[PDB]
Amino acid sequence: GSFVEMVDNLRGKSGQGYYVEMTVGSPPQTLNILVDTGSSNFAVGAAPHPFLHRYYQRQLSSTYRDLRKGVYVPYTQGKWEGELGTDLVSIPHGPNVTVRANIAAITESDKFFINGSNWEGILGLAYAEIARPDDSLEPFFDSLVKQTHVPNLFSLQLCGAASVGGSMIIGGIDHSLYTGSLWYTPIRREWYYEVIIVRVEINGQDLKMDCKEYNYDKSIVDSGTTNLRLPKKVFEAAVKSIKAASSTEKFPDGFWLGEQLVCWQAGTTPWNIFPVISLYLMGEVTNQSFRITILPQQYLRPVEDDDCYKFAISQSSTGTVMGAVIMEGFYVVFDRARKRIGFAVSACHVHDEFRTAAVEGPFVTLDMEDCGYN
Ligand SMILES: CC(C)(C)c1cccc(CN[C@H]2CS(=O)(=O)C[C@@H](Cc3cc(F)c4c(c3)C3(CCC(F)(F)CC3)CN4)[C@@H]2O)c1
């Protein structure tokens, strides 16, 4: 509570990410910035690229300082390169402070900006270890914490819908955004927001795989990604098992690949025939775990075109990526200070009549440490 300045400060178009309003420079230039717990660079467009609504103009900033060094970041999805500097940054619908963060002024890019999107930059919320050019470049939230008395902690409530909304509470937790209790899983290493998944159930049936497979080569919480991404073998077992639960109908190969939609007459979507999915996460206490459960309403994204949906669980090059499909069911707390991530059922999650998202525990799981890849 007492974080209503910040409630509902996230916007976006579904499948195009969530962004938050920010100001940089003196005088303050407003930009919409993509919120990404999957990287650690703060970067903005700095030139009149045709896709951009606005861009960062350093000429205008009296507080701008050049850093004279270049920087290059290749994501899976895309790539940019720019010039480093520092400036005064603030989040209007956040806590009224201002910090001197590093900024990547994007001078060239490819497949990074979305033609049609309403954002112009990316805010890397993860740790310095994975910042570019190297961990010497202080990530934004590190700067925010060192320079103010704002608590080393933030939380995201992403609410799945063309338009999408959500909240980023900075420095706090807002208890009206979740129901039930928060359960914490350890942040395994401070680079990505890495975690250990110790077990997976589909409608309640263990997928029966060595838990190490769930996390090769790592599992992370990534707000800049849309899908629940599973490692290849795990992905196979999962889809196989979902087909079985939904055999009451059957669908084209391409649906399970996310390349072809499936539609029903509006309001007749056979929700009951799709299984709830569960990830057990390592808990705070030795041999203790807990479970998060998402409904089909989370992994079937609606798409315009009847009621049509895209299958939004997909295969992963890395380990497990808990992206938007996962986060839109839960209030996620990034407790950097206590080095742990918190999950609670979201106040804004989409649920049907008979079933609901869940965070439950505790469970007994031995050898949880063995689920990690080393
Ligand atoms: C930054 C670093 C450490 C070098 C790094 C390299 C590879 C993977 C990762 C893990 N986090 C990644 C996972 S990703 O590449 O799928 C999305 C990426 C952020 C990202 C980068 C883009 F060029 C684009 C998007 C997101 C968009 C917008 C939002 C979306 F979710 F709709 C998706 C599309 C459009 N293009 C995350 O940061 C970090």
Considering Cα of 173, then 10, then 76, then 320, what sign does the dihedral take? positive
Q: Note whether 156 and 130 are same-domain residues.
A: no
Last residue of a domain, one of 123, 150, 177: 150
Question: What's the CA-to-centroid distance between 130 and ligand 1, angstroms?
Answer: 13
Closest by Cα among 366, 371, 338 to 184 = 338
Q: Note whether 159 and 275 are same-domain residues.
A: yes
Asked whether the beta carbons of 324 and 313 are under 8 A apart, the reply is no
Q: Note whether 184 and 80 are same-domain residues.
A: no
Counting the structural domains of the chain, the total is 2
Q: Note whether 206 and 283 are same-domain residues.
A: yes
DSSP conformation letters of 179-216: EEEEEEEE--SBTTBEE-EEEEEETTEE----GGGGSS
Asked whether the beta carbons of 321 and 168 are under 8 A apart, the reply is no
Question: CA-to-CA distance for 102 and 138, rounded, in angstroms?
Answer: 7
Question: What's the CA-to-centroid distance between 77 and ligand 1, angstroms?
Answer: 5
Question: What's the CA-to-centroid distance between 233 and ligand 1, angstroms?
Answer: 23
Last residue of a domain, one of 150, 171, 189: 150
**Enclosing domain of residue 40:** 18-150
Find out whether the beta carbon of 302 lies less than 6 Å from any atom of ligand 1: no
Nearest CA to ligand 1 atom 18: 224
Q: Note whether 319 and 196 are same-domain residues.
A: yes
333-350 as b/e, with b when 16 or more CB fall inside 10 Å?
bbbbeeebbbbbbbebbb
Cα end-to-end span (Å), the chain: 40
Considering Cα of 105, then 109, then 112, then 118, what sign does the dihedral take? positive
Question: What's the CA-to-centroid distance between 189 and ligand 1, angstroms?
Answer: 19
Atom of ligand 1 nearest to the CA of 226: 31
Angle at 323 between CA 177 and CA 287, to 5 degrees: 80
Q: Note whether 292 and 172 are same-domain residues.
A: yes
CATH number of the domain at 225, please.
Answer: 2.40.70.10
In a domain, 59, yes or no: yes
In a domain, 97, yes or no: yes
Asked whether the beta carbons of 314 and 258 are under 8 A apart, the reply is yes
In a domain, 5, yes or no: no
Q: Note whether 156 and 144 are same-domain residues.
A: no
| Partner residues linked to 207 by β-bridges | none
Question: CA-to-CA distance for 273 and 276, rounded, in angstroms?
Answer: 10
Q: Note whether 295 and 177 are same-domain residues.
A: yes
Last residue of a domain, one of 150, 168, 183: 150
Q: Note whether 167 and 22 are same-domain residues.
A: no
Find out whether the beta carbon of 316 lies less than 6 Å from any atom of ligand 1: no
Find out whether the beta carbon of 224 lies less than 6 Å from any atom of ligand 1: yes
In a domain, 345, yes or no: yes
In a domain, 11, yes or no: no
Q: Note whether 117 and 224 are same-domain residues.
A: no
In a domain, 2, yes or no: no
Catalytic residue ranges = 36, 222
Hey, what amino acid is at 353?
A: E
Q: Note whether 110 and 50 are same-domain residues.
A: yes
In a domain, 8, yes or no: no
Asked whether the beta carbons of 281 and 197 are under 8 A apart, the reply is yes
Cβ-proximal residues to 32 (8 Å cutoff; 6+ apart), any chain: 11, 19, 20, 21, 22, 53, 54, 118, 119, 120, 121
Nearest CA to ligand 1 atom 39: 39
Element (H, E) at 254: helix 253-256
Q: Note whether 300 and 326 are same-domain residues.
A: yes
In a domain, 10, yes or no: no
Alpha carbon 59 to its chain centroid, in Å, reads: 33
Atom of ligand 1 nearest to the CA of 117: 28
